[PDB]
């Protein structure tokens, strides 16, 4: 009868204060997170690939995505989404030096209407 | 005969001694340094083992059972120890108290709500007890080595508790078997 | 500090105590280094520092140990230093 | 039946199964003072290792403490344990009292009373 | 002690000194290991032997000083260790007492435990070493060269596991001494 | 690859470019219970390694932000 | 009587020793060699198409 | 609702009868006609290791 324990309430009442869906006390130790990356499939890559920034986000980086275009310009399961993904890619690049940046935009312009 | 028969009690205003600041044949404080366990996401039973064989001096060479040498364990955040999978919600607390009705059978969750600190100090004195029970002062002694702070903030700044660094060779999950 | 040392007994050192701890901020800094002097003389560093005993209290197995009213006294100091 | 009270020995990380082939060792210790140990082999089959004593080790030790904390200073613990590797490598003897007992006898350095019963370092007849 | 001995002359004059100051051995006597050092006594299961008499023991697993070890596999050779006998006696009496329940039987044995008293007086040790040896890769190394370490080693950080517990930087770069120079 | 390829296979069952989304989202009402791998943890896989990878000159330099 | 040759163990003399590697690190943050970035975009590029 | 031995003992019994989860058990709900409610027999939804196995 300490009430700090054992309260004054039957189990019928108190069943609904279980939680099933639990979030903070966390069931997840971090000797498994890099296990469940490895068996995801996914691969470290070095810093200049790529990396999982602030929000834990997969952005590749450019002058890697670029190399990437310049390996898979002509494959078959190249779409014309991938260009223009890889000029998104390109545009930090594009504003902190337009002289030698926009003839890579130009490479792929040229490219991609051929 | 040697042990008094007057004791020191609880309900005596004497009150209880601290084994860190009481000065004993057995208790040597000496040699002993201060470590820091960073608890986020380690298994709190885990935990509770390490810190047990740092606070109870096994992890020294020229450890002795009778002579009680111990390392202060500084063990932050518990708030964000992981219990695995249901058993936050399936591992019970049992104890008896000596009155009519004996059971108070408490759910990890609802000592969590209480005070998480009293997880840890419970999983503690498991690890601790499995060693020693048969003799009051060497179960209760080691315990006071622990320091349970279940956020980033403490005051130990002055010790330079150095990292503990430790991985857990065990790769499942932590299991509940209680008789 | 003359009724401090002048008159030892117990009673009129809690009766020094009470009104120097009732005037700390009413007076200057000097002043207070001529006060903290008198009133550490009954202070031995080996010695414990406040311990001022009076009565055995053998009611229980152990025996309890009370102090007198000088305790609190110089306690009242302190707070109202802190103050 | 008794439950079993003896001191159990910690888990050590499971191995790949890289360790069942033969010419690696299951042990792995790769430490800081690791390539100091130097291995000579004797003619009778056995080995002859070369190690820096104890006190270099220590001083090893002191080095790599005071360099970390160049930084934000020295810390009280930090303080006695330097006091203390200091003391070891030093040695010559064994130390048999308490380290406070020189301390607590010498307290009436550190706080200084009224002039009237002032301690010095000479007393008597003064 | 007569010095250490190898073919090659660069590596004698770099462990000669090495060997020099006090000396520890690890002795097999009587089924029972013994840490031994110059002016240590031990009390070893008996022996027949003279009182006040002039030993050297056998078996020796290993030896050491402040600067070197020599770590015997099973056993060493070239090692001189010399003992004196001191006493001979029997030891505290260890009483066993059998009773049986049911029976009315009871039965003191005491256990003297016979023992000769041992004080050592040398250890000396003379190894005939053959070269260095590397020990990541095995191999006896050729070439003898003091200054550069034999295995280099090298600090664990890749970047690559971000729950690496992170040890004080100071500890995690920290390089050590070179000792034969 | 196999959400991409529910993308890119035509719309039959159900509706793409509408609001109105015939299957409602229900994570609620799906099973809420624990895995043998919520307990044993995630399952072993071989770890992805790279073979035969050029040795790492420039391995002492450290890579600049690449935002330039 | 007990007696150390080299020293007795105190808490503070392997205290100050950290873990090592046998083989340097392939540091996550480098600069790639020409070589190394031509493999590394290989390899992505392989498991790119490979996917697509 | 009444407790079948197992799933295979679960039908539905009706045009607008469903397969619903309760916490992990298996169950039968009919939104209209409530008498055809079925659930599979197992744990209750909160239990301790002591209290149940
Ligand atoms: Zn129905």
Redesign the pocket.
């Given at each position: 009868k300490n009430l700090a324990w054992r309260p004054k309430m039957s189990e019928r009442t108190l069943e609904q204060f279980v939680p099933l869906h639990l979030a903070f006390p966390r069931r997840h130790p971090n000797s498994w997170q890099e296990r469940q990356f490895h068996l995801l499939g996914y691969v470290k890559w070095p810093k200049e690939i790529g990396f999982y920034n602030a929000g834990d986000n997969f952005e590749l980086t450019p002058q890697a995505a670029y190399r990437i275009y310049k390996q898979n310009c002509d494959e078959t399961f190249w779409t014309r989404l991938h260009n223009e993904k890889t000029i998104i890619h390109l545009l930090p690049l594009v504003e902190q030096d337009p002289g030698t940046n926009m003839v890579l935009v130009d490479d792929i312009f040229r490219h991609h209407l051929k | 005969p040697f042990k008094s028969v007057l004791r020191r009690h609880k309900h005596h205003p004497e009150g209880l001694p601290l084994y860190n600041d009481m000065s004993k044949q057995w208790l040597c404080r000496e040699g002993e340094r201060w470590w820091l366990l960073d608890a986020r996401g380690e298994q709190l039973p885990r935990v509770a083992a390490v810190a047990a064989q740092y606070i109870t001096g096994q992890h020294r060479p020229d450890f002795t059972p009778g002579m009680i040498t111990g390392d202060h364990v500084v063990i932050v955040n518990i708030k964000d120890v992981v219990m695995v999978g249901d058993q936050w919600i399936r591992v019970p607390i049992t104890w008896q108290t000596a009155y009519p009705g004996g059971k108070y059978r408490i759910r990890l969750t609802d000592m969590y709500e209480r005070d998480p600190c009293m997880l840890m100090w419970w999983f503690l004195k498991d690890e601790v007890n499995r060693h020693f029970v048969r003799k009051l002062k060497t179960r209760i002694a080691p315990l006071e080595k622990a320091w349970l702070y279940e956020d980033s903030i403490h005051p130990h700044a002055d010790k330079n508790p150095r990292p503990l660094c430790w991985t857990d060779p065990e790769v499942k999950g932590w299991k509940y078997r209680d008789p | 500090v003359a009724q401090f040392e002048d008159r030892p007994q117990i009673e009129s050192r809690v009766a020094a105590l009470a009104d120097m701890a009732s005037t700390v901020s009413f007076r200057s800094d000097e002043e207070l280094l001529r006060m903290f002097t008198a009133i550490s003389a009954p202070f031995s560093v080996d010695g414990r520092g406040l311990n001022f005993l009076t009565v055995k209290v053998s009611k229980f197995g152990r025996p309890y140990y009370v102090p007198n009213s000088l305790l609190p006294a110089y306690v009242n100091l302190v707070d109202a230093t802190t103050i | 039946p008794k439950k079993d009270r003896r001191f159990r020995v910690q888990p050590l990380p499971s191995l790949h199964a890289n360790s069942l082939a033969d010419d690696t060792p299951l042990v792995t210790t790769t430490r800081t003072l690791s390539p100091n140990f130097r291995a000579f082999a004797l003619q009778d089959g056995g080995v002859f290792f070369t190690h820096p004593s104890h006190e270099q080790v220590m001083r090893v030790g002191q080095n790599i403490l005071a360099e970390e904390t160049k930084a934000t200073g020295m810390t009280s613990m930090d303080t006695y344990v330097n006091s203390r590797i200091q003391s070891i490598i030093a040695e010559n003897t064994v130390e048999n009292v308490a380290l406070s007992h020189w301390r607590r006898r010498h307290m009436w350095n550190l706080v200084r009373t009224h002039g009237k019963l002032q301690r010095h370092w000479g007393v008597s007849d003064a | 002690a007569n010095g250490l001995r190898c073919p090659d002359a660069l590596i004698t004059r770099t462990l000669n000194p090495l060997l020099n100051g006090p000396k520890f051995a690890v002795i097999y006597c009587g089924n029972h290991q013994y840490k031994v050092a110059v002016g240590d006594v031990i009390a070893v299961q008996r022996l027949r032997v003279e009182i006040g008499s002039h030993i050297a023991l056998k078996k020796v697993l290993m030896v050491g000083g402040p600067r070197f070890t020599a770590i015997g596999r099973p056993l060493l050779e070239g090692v001189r260790v010399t003992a004196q006998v001191e006493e001979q006696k029997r030891m505290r009496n260890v009483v066993s007492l059998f009773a049986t329940p049911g029976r009315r039987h009871v039965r003191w044995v005491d256990a003297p435990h016979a023992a000769t008293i041992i004080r050592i007086c040398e250890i000396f040790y003379s190894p005939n070493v053959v070269g260095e040896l590397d020990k990541y890769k095995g191999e006896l190394l050729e070439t003898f060269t003091p200054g550069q370490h034999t295995n280099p080693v090298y600090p664990v950080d890749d970047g690559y596991d971000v729950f690496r517990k992170k040890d004080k930087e100071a500890m995690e770069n920290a390089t050590t001494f070179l000792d034969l120079l | 690859i196999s959400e991409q390829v529910q993308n890119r296979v035509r719309s039959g069952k159900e509706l793409v470019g509408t609001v109105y989304q015939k299957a409602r989202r229900q994570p609620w009402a799906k099973y809420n219970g624990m895995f043998p791998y919520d307990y044993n943890g995630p399952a072993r896989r071989p770890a992805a390694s790279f073979v035969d990878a050029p040795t790492p000159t420039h391995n002492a330099e450290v890579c600049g932000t690449a935002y330039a | 009587q007990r007696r150390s040759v080299q020293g007795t163990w105190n808490p503070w003399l392997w205290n100050y020793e950290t873990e090592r590697r046998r083989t340097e690190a392939p540091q996550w943050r480098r600069k790639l060699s020409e070589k190394e970035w031509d493999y590394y975009v290989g390899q992505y590029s392989a498991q790119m198409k490979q996917e697509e | 609702p009444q407790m079948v031995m197992s799933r295979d003992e679960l039908k539905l019994?009706?045009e607008y009868?469903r397969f619903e989860w309760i916490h992990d058990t298996l169950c039968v709900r009919?939104p209209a006609?409530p008498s055809?409610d079925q659930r599979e027999m197992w744990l209750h939804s909160t239990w301790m290791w002591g209290k149940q196995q």
């Open positions: - | - | - | - | - | - | - | 019994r009706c009868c009919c006609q055809h």
